[PDB]
Design a protein around this nucleic acid. Structure first.
Length: 61
DNA sequence: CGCTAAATGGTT
DNA sequence: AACCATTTAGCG
């Protein structure tokens, strides 16, 4: 039992990256606001942010 | 294969 | 509950 891989829209990727350039971390309230704005789940936004921080560390190494 | 979403197991 | 480090795995 596995979740289908979300395919993010161009609009969703654009707004997640904008969120990340403004704030490396999100409060619970900012995370839930972002998910609602993008029509994603809280956990999909929490996962994108986590994986984005992993990417951020590798490309600043 | 590379990028990156989701899962695993640990940390805090 | 959320994050971290790493692994697993889907898709272009």
């Amino acid at each position: 039992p596995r979740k289908a891989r979300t395919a993010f829209s161009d609009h969703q990727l654009n707004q997640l990256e904008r969120s990340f350039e403004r704030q490396k971390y999100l409060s619970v309230q900012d995370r839930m606001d972002l998910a609602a704005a993008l029509n994603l789940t809280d956990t999909q936004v929490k996962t994108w942010y986590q994986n984005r921080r992993t990417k951020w560390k590798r490309q600043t190494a």
